[PDB]
């Protein structure tokens, strides 16, 4: 039933709102300057990065600059993996999958979801950090010494094009769900049940886009290509990651990320 597909769409959106603290809706309001909330602290150079040390709060307690920024992205990614795991568990059928298949879906899925959702926090000028407490300029991130100055440009470039599609949180909830339920991730044991779930999610997405974006017939086909594109973004990221792990004297990589990156491309 189409009605059931709308109910599924709504369930995913409600779960999405529960699982992810900063939504695109709120992020756009902040970025444009509509919210009654206090303005994000702007980090545009080294000096303002230092000043931001006091103002911006991080959930994790931690009693050179390029490295600290990279480690900061690391920890945000750790938080994001946990948020995304919570969301995946709300997708009907997911928790009933073989547990090792659940692990596999997350392992290969999370970074693609991280960068999808990171777009919501980005414009052409910079990215929101720490739930909107801070805004780091795209230019400052680019100015970082190599290899780090190029760490995030691929993502800003993806985000600028992706945001031009003008999806909202209701679109994104289903888009994310489809990506997570990918039946072609390496090493999946029981493919059919994942394919069947994704097939229904894809039907939900198609109907969502037809109703929510009536004038843009091409949107569904474009989003399917963005899913393929996201795999390339993650590939590039993993490769720059190996460059960093070497071209720098070894730094600490979070064990959750180590686990994900093992056998990741």
């Amino acid at each position: 039933e189409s009605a059931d597909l709308r109910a599924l769409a709504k369930h995913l959106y409600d779960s999405y709102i529960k699982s992810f603290p900063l939504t695109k809706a709120k992020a756009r309001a902040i970025l444009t300057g509509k919210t009654t909330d206090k303005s994000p602290f702007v980090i545009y150079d080294m000096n303002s990065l230092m000043m931001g040390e006091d103002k911006i709060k991080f959930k994790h307690i931690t009693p050179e600059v390029a490295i600290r920024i990279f480690q900061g992205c690391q920890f945000r990614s750790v938080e994001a993996v946990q948020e995304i795991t919570e969301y995946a568990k709300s997708i009907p059928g997911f928790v009933n999958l073989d547990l090792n298949d659940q692990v596999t879906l997350l392992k290969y899925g999370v970074h693609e979801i991280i960068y999808t959702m990171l777009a919501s926090l980005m414009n052409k000028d910079g990215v929101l950090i720490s739930e909107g407490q801070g805004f780091m300029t795209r230019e400052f991130l680019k100015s970082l010494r190599k290899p780090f100055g190029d760490f995030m440009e691929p993502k800003f470039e993806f985000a600028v094009k992706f945001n031009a599609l003008e999806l909202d949180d209701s679109d994104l909830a289903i888009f994310i769900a489809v990506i997570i339920l990918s039946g072609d991730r390496p090493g999946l044991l029981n493919v059919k049940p994942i394919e069947d779930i994704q097939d229904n999610l894809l039907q939900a997405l198609e109907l969502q886009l037809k109703l929510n974006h009536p004038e843009s017939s091409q949107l569904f086909a474009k989003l399917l290509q963005k899913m393929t594109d996201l795999r390339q973004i993650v590939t590039e990221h993993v490769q720059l990651l190996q460059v960093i792990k070497k071209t720098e004297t070894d730094m600490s990589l979070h064990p959750l990320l180590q686990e994900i990156y093992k056998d990741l491309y």
Binding site: V81, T85, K89, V95, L99, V103, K107, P255, L256, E259
Partner: peptide, 10 residues
Amino acid sequence: SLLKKLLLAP
């Protein structure tokens, strides 16, 4: 694995 633990937690 750590991912498995996150998945199992209610």
